[PDB]
Design a protein around this ligand. Structure first.
Ligand SMILES: [Mg+2]
Ligand SMILES: [Mg+2]
Ligand SMILES: [Mg+2]
Ligand SMILES: [Mg+2]
Ligand SMILES: [Mg+2]
Length: 749
RNA sequence: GCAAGAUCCUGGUAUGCUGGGGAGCCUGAAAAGGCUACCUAGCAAGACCCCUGGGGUCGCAUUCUUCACCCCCUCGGCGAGGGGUUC
DNA sequence: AGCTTGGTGTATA
DNA sequence: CCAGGATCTTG
DNA sequence: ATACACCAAGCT
């Protein structure tokens, strides 16, 4: 089903986006824009706060797990050494908070003549020193730690500061003696400072070093008269540390292929999108005859010869030598902007965008389709013409700075031939923009991997059986068997929970017995409850909130001419507690038990409609799905959304999240984020230079449309559009995610 | 070419949270509650393998999960990794 | 009652 | 937060 | 330090 045409490929690579064009050619002039799509990616970023990528967060978590594993193994080996020496380690409970510190202070101060008491104090001191040993260089050997100046100069400065503050001198002033003395003298004192966060002045200021703990242990050994091999073994067990190695980063030569990852996140996202587009374009129109790529001027902050440019040249030249691409040329930013400038093509005129800035011309970054338009413009480019345009800009910027207290055109026959050949490019762009064939899409994240819950462990609340129970207290029951038993109490014919959060579900009953499969709970027995009336799971003996939702399952019930819709918001914790995070599981259609937080905190109408059997699952929505409202647009606008839709009549909206049980958060697909953020900045510091549409767009972002699901899915002709790699909506029901209509979708199974 | 770095990766540290404790202080004194520290265990759910338990290794990346089709790579029908699937 | 929307808490250095 | 190993960039 | 999920006044 491949019809070979003559077409060229245009790729603009940005920090958060990539624009791609397949332009069919007839006589070395543009003939047909086959596909133009801009793909918005996160560049591998999973933490928007710190800018850390998903791979970096995963590596930090994995190394934290490995640190805990090695710490557990090292402390177990120390415990076996202390058992071999007969020294008793510090017990888990039923000891004073300062037994370890007082043991360290007493062994570093005086000699202990009692045998069992000395061994007990030595075991307490050595176990506590292994739990708190301070930092050393990981490449420094134990022998090199022993060759360090003991004590360290930072601890000498700290000890002099402590002697100045408290007017006392301890010989020898180890951290064990000073901490024990300060915990006896000024109780409640903090020992180490916190950079995270009334005037509890800390005892120490610098980070503890392993040489100081080693010096204190050797001072304790010299005072107590321990044998040399015993001291050597105790040092080698307390300060044991794995040396750093290189397991994973194990780095004419053959150029890498398209399917091979490059290791860097932004380049990997751009490579994956370009690889999918190139594969689909090859299967539908044959191979391209050249590939023109525009790396951005950015994409490195905190002809291009950057790492992204080198990786893209090597992989696209691998594809070229495997498929027959005649040349591959990669340019440096921002050549395509001036190439768009000389043909009189503006995004604000091409897509009929209203003006946002009162003074000066608005930046093209407002409409996200500018990437695909730049890819179309890039398709026409050649390296000689790009050189002439770069020389023209370099000549123009100096005359522009000179003429402030120009514009002069450099002459080129290749530029003249290019401008003659690209006369109809503007007409093609108008024609393709009129029928809305230029698409802005985002890649879907469908794998159920990530943080399963929030990190903060929370304390359990607790409720008696025999008291009065409200709806929130029913919803917060931790144990699923007790939850199902209270479910059978409040509704014996029901399988799900349909109560208001504030209503009084059931009164006090002094002889209520909750029967189970393994015990019987009396009316005086106390049920473990989640602390708050929100989605939570039981992890490691505590409660944690659920993370962000993986998806929302769409349910429909009622008549054909007027149905009702609701979302079942499913997080990774629901799939974790349902046992669905395993092999061979379709996580969008698998049945969730009633005790999951999804079905606990679903809307009451959805619960009652599923219990009545009327409501069936007709589809699913992930963050990043595109809602095409059709040519009608949004007919249920109210509030600031109406004033937004007067000047930006958007029909394509992107799902970002599901903020409660009845609402879905939608942003406009074609409108950018950072442009509206700098509009907010100019609203903050430059009054009256912003138009009314700019003011409304600045107020609309960042939270966009917090939209009622009943007000969204009540539109006939609304489609959940899932694109192919070329930016075309997938309408054939296959094994890839397809476009569907909420008003007409078949029920699952 | 000093090196400002960018991407990770490896080894550590100190807080923080939860469970169990408690040195000082404040209440309650019948009894147990809080604050500041400090001690101790754990810090994704879990999964696999080896000798009841234990110990080791993976588990937040590769944005269309699973399934289906096609292509590529390593080892010995056979799994593990990747990649693509046009509207 | 129900939709707008304003504010805020998240593991961190 | 720390030190330092590997690519690869820019100086 | 983000952005999303949750909470809790206001309009209608
Ligand atoms: Mg673990
Ligand atoms: Mg400890
Ligand atoms: Mg330590
Ligand atoms: Mg671009
Ligand atoms: Mg401790």
């Amino acid at each position: 089903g491949t019809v070979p045409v003559t077409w060229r490929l245009g790729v603009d690579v940005g920090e958060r986006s990539i624009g791609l064009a397949a332009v069919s050619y007839e006589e070395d002039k543009p003939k047909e824009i086959l596909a133009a799509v801009s793909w918005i990616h996160d560049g591998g970023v999973g933490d928007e706060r710190s800018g850390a990528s998903r791979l970096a967060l995963r590596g930090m978590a994995r190394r934290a797990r490995r640190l805990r594993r090695f710490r557990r193994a090292r402390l177990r080996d120390l415990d076996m050494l202390l058992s071999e020496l007969g020294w008793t380690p510090l017990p888990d409970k039923n000891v004073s908070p300062v037994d370890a510190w007082l043991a360290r202070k007493r062994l570093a101060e005086e000699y202990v003549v009692d045998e069992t008491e000395r061994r007990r104090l030595l075991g307490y001191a050595v176990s506590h020193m292994a739990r708190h040993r301070g930092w050393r260089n990981p490449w420094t050997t134990i022998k090199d730690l022993k060759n360090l100046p003991q004590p360290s100069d930072s601890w000498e400065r700290t000890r002099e500061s402590l002697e100045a503050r408290y007017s006392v001198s301890l010989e020898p002033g180890t951290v064990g003696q000073w901490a024990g003395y300060l915990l006896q003298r000024a109780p409640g004192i903090r020992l180490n400072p916190t950079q995270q966060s009334l005037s509890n002045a800390t005892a120490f200021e610098t980070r503890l070093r392993q040489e100081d703990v080693l010096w204190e242990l050797r001072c304790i050994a010299d005072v107590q008269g321990l044998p040399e091999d015993v001291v050597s073994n105790v040092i080698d067990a307390v300060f044991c540390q794995k040396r750093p190695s290189v397991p994973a980063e194990r780095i004419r030569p053959p150029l890498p292929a398209l399917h091979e990852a490059t290791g860097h996140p932004v380049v990997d996202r751009n490579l994956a999108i370009l690889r999918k587009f190139l594969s689909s374009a090859t299967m539908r129109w044959g191979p391209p005859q050249s590939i023109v790529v525009e790396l951005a001027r950015g994409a490195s902050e905190s002809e291009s010869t950057g790492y992204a440019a080198v990786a893209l040249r090597d992989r696209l030249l691998s594809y070229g030598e495997k498929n027959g691409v005649a040349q591959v040329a990669v340019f440096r930013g921002g050549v395509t902007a001036e190439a768009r400038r000389w043909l009189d093509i503006s995004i604000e005129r091409l897509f009929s965008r209203v003006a946002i800035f009162a003074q000066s011309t608005s930046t093209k970054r407002l409409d996200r389709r500018h990437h695909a338009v730049d890819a179309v413009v890039l398709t026409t480019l050649t390296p000689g013409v790009a050189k002439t345009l770069a020389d023209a800009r370099s000549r123009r910027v100096s005359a522009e700075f000179w003429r402030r207290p120009s514009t002069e055109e450099p002459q080129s026959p290749a530029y003249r031939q290019w401008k003659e050949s690209c006369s109809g490019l503007g007409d093609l762009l108008i024609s393709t923009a009129a029928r809305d064939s230029i698409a802005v899409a985002a890649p879907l994240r469908l794998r159920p991997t990530g943080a399963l819950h929030e990190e903060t462990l929370r304390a359990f609340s607790e409720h008696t059986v025999g008291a009065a129970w409200k709806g929130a207290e029913l919803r917060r029951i931790v144990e699923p068997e007790v939850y199902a038993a209270f479910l059978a109490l409040t509704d014996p014919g029901g399988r799900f929970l349909k109560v208001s959060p504030s209503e009084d579900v059931l009164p006090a009953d002094e002889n209520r017995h909750i029967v189970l499969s393994d015990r019987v709970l009396g009316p005086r027995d106390r049920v473990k409850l989640f602390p708050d009336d929100r989605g939570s799971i039981r992890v490691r003996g505590g409660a944690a909130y659920i993370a962000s939702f993986h998806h929302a399952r769409v349910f429909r019930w009622g008549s054909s001419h007027s149905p009702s819709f609701a979302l079942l918001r499913v997080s990774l914790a629901d799939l974790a507690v349902a046992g669905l995070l395993r092999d061979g599981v379709d996580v969008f259609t698998a049945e969730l038990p009633p005790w999951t937080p999804a079905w606990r905190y679903a809307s009451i109408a959805l619960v009652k409609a599923v219990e009545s059997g009327d409501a069936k699952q007709v589809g699913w929505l992930v963050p990043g799905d595109e809602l095409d409202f059709g040519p009608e647009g949004v007919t249920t606008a109210a509030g600031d959304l109406s004033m937004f839709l007067k000047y930006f009549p958007e029909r394509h909206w992107v799902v970002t999240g599901f903020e409660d049980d009845k609402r879905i958060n939608l942003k406009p697909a074609f409108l950018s984020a950072e442009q509206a953020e700098v509009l907010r900045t100019e609203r903050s510091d430059r009054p009256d230079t912003l138009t009314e549409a700019g003011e409304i767009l600045a107020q609309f972002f960042p939270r966009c449309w917090r939209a009622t699901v009943a007000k969204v899915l009540c539109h006939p002709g609304l489609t959940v559009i899932r694109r192919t790699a070329l930016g075309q909506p997938r309408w054939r029901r296959g094994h890839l995610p397809y476009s569907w209509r909420p008003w007409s979708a078949d029920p699952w199974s």
